[PDB]
Amino acid sequence: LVPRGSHMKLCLVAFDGRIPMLSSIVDRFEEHVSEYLGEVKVKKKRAKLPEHAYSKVRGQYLARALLDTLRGMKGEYDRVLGLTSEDLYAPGLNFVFGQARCPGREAVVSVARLLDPDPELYLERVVKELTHELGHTFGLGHCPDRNCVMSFSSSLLEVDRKSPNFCRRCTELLQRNLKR
Ligand SMILES: [Zn+2]
Ligand SMILES: [Zn+2]
Question: Which CATH class is domain 8-180?
Answer without folding.
Answer: alpha beta
